[PDB]
Amino acid sequence: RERTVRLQYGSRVEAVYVLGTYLWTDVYSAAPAGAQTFSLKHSEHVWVEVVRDGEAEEVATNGKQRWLLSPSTTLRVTMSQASTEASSDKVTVNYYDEEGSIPIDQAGLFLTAIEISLDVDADRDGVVEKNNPKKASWTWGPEGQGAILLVNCDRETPWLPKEDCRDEKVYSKEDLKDMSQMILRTKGPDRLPAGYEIVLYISMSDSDKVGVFYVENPQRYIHILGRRKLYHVVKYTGGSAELLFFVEGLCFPDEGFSGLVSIHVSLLEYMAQDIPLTPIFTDTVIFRIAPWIMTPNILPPVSVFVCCMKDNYLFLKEVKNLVEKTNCELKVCIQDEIEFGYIEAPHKGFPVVLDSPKELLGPDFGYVTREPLFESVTSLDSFGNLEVSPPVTVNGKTYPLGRILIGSSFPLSGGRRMTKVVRDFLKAQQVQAPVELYSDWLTVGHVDEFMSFVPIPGTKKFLLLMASTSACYKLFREKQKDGHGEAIMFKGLGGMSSKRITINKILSNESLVQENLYFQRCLDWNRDILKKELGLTEQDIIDLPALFKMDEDHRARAFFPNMVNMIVLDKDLGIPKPFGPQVEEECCLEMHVRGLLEPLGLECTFIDGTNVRRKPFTFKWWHMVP
């Protein structure tokens, strides 16, 4: 900051100087008519150069020198420490004519130096450092810098019908732990010279994205900037001072919101009561609002939310028994209305649930929805149609939080699609760079019908499980050749089950073969996208046998329990029970799925839906580089 302050003909000029800046001071134009030259005195804690065509030259407090008056002779004026005294520091210029050695006129400059700094934790260690030089920018990576702000989308006080950030009020001191600290630090005399004040302010635009709070009697919580509050005039305390504000995020990154917000402080000069003139100093901090992040299946489970809204014991017992052999909780009352994720800042973080188009909205449990407006919901809006990969590297790039996957239709198909308003939210989060797959070939239309990830438990590595109809046909032709043709299929369930569906019955159904050829085609289309977009190879993929029937819409609905659609609890796999053609003790499908999976570390339990909240990534999203 080089800033202009001219001397004024015949006058003394009072100026505030902010430490960190430079004054350039015209002396020429204040000079009386007929002067040819000037000297100057200045005070101890004011540094003063003279400057002609770029050539600097320090000058003594005391010296008696005279120079030639000229528009290209100017001063540069700096100060090193704040004033304890309103003025005291000063620069005084004497002007002189051809003859005499007494000055003909003089002009002066009376400085009050102050320090003003609006400070944030741009280096991201949870401590509000002093005037971080990067605090007005935001960069990615471990070298990156720039403060981080959470959306205050949880709830501290449960009598509130909505989340914290929905009001312009802080009710509990609990709340402030979710907030980001911003410190106005000042250093100067017992007061400001007359005509100055300090204003914090925000833009109209940012006014619905931030809320700023002052804690009085640090007690009451003063809402100073935010909705319908674009500025706030700050009472200066003299001496070395610090004001503490707490900042809450209100809106997630989204369509038309990068997630970056600014807050400013200005030293504003006034002419009277009212009559604002111009700022003489401005300081600015940047915040990025933390994205919502989804949790893939490789990440350790913390709790498993079931909800059979009926009378289940054996679904409750095989899901309870599985959960027990893990660290984690059960949590009864699902997969289609709710997606678990989190938000993190260096100070703080907590789980947030995306709610599909309220209920778990608690302390340290946050909440977002996105609401269509014109576009109608379909089946593809259900969060069974929303999954996320493990960490992957795709051709050099790294995706340390994985990628979101959403089922879709082809763009010129007229098919179903998840609402744009949810699609836009998810891409706007950036850090899980979403991928559209093709799920609309399915009656229901969900990615979780045909793929799943499982961690290989020694690693540190995962596998893509894919449904495969061709795998199924290969298996049946073996069984039937093994003499199990007349072995009956799907004897178990108590609605639509088996009127002697045998393998033979199936294998000789030519119509159903062709449908399943079309479906294998839909599957291979997805396989090619997943391989490309998660940088996978055939090494990384296991095809689980699967069979569909083609409904009236030309869409697949499962023939028997889709086994890829499982609960992944670390090493325990909760895998739907197929009920299929036997050979002895157990099923030849169950034994086949046990065949592929168990030799890798994976411990399959077959269950006759759920949802699992998981540990965050250790990996900090700000260290990424999207």
Added chain:
Amino acid sequence: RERTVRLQYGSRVEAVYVLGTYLWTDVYSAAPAGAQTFSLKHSEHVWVEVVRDGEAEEVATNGKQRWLLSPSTTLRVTMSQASTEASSDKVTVNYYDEEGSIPIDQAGLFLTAIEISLDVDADRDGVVEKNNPKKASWTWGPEGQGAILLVNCDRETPWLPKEDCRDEKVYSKEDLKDMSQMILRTKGPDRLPAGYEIVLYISMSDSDKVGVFYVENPQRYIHILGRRKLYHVVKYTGGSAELLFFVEGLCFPDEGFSGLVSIHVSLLEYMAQDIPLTPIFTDTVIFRIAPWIMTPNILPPVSVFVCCMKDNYLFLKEVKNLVEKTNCELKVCIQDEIEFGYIEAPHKGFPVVLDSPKELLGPDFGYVTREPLFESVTSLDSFGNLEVSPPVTVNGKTYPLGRILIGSSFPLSGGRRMTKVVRDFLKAQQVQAPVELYSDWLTVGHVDEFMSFVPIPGTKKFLLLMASTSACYKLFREKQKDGHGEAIMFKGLGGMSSKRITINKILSNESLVQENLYFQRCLDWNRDILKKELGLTEQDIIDLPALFKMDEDHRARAFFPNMVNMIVLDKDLGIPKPFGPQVEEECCLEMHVRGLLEPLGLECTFIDGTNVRRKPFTFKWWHMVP
């Protein structure tokens, strides 16, 4: 592109292969029950590896080998050259049981290889190279790559009431010179196997940003993609073929439009008449739509558009005489409704006029407006409030096309502002990274009232001229001390002029002094922004004397002709005539302005408004790095 194609139990499978891709082919799952092993034959121009847990292995056309059947034993299938024959190329697998040496079943794959490439001039030399590997991306800098598309905002046929891009029709072959070439190149047999076609397509979103044309009888101009045309089915010509399309841009970069657009081609498989299935190959080109670019005063003038809509001869004659001593034209009938700029691509470029909230819309003379909607126009929307710097470097960054400057008010002032819709357009152009100044302290509210750039003609360097009231007062106190106090001011003009305004009269007006102190403050505020944002120093600045009077709104209107508000024609400066206090032959203001400027190369002519179209930058905007 690794792409899945399975063999199918007992069947022969016909596939199209696109050169540049890889097939992965499952053999396991097509295998009959009880086989333990497979061999394979394949044709000359089909390369075939076998692959287990990652381990490759080429195989002979001829060989007789057998391998062990297993899900992790698969093939990889490539081809090197296109087919002249529908099929001919092929891969055939034999399956075998424990005993016999005759195959038990077989499965085959019958390939037709074709080459398909959608090509553009992503390397930006005006030639459409062959399958540029970067043609699906857009990058900046001399190393950057990515094709460029002009907005077709000029007019070839003048019977049209609007610009070319306003219809979905090309009337003249002239037009196509403004268009970008995109070449669908194919190489294959006399026809495609049954069930395939080639579709060009665009997104709904891009559909109002691009228009694509086919030239028939290369004759008629076929509009194939664009408004209400999202796809087009292409007739395949056999052999080595090339289809030529011409692409027009329709919309400039803007709020919510990055300026990037995509065009795709897919090979789409069908089941019947209708019944589209899935694409088997897709290719994509990217275009960036060229920004509108403004021309600063250092750039050589080409023509000077005057328009005194009255009876001017001495304004016509001093502007004509000045124009004559330059290369350039006069062009009579201005500065406030029109801004001259251009658009460039590697093939092509032409002047485009931004029209402030039609007339010069010609061949190779284009047109944009932006139209407010809710927001009302003010004086600050006039293009006197729109200027552009010379090339500058600001703290490492380079701005080789300069920066746009717009006068504004303070954001919490309730003051006037140029319409958002024009502000958003200008920033969206990116390459001249606009700067908001403070012009609302002026009655009219234009940046051109208080600053101007002039080229120093030996360089290669420019100067910022600033209006200065303090300079004026310094000058008058000299004159009055020189005994010119009673020398009369502003005797010339024929409306509001002089009832013995003398220097003395002015100097003793204390009220007017204070107003001009406030105005010098407004000026220094701007000075500080310009220094910061154009990386200038005091070396680079000349203050021209100037005086304002404060209207009822607390706003400056010039006291005498604002001399900074000049025509800059290379070395000739067309500088408003002040009419001020004399000493002999000429004015002491005129002689003072001649004093500062002429010693640098600059050749001042004083004129008792205009607009100048200039040469583009030699510098190509795509070599920048915003």
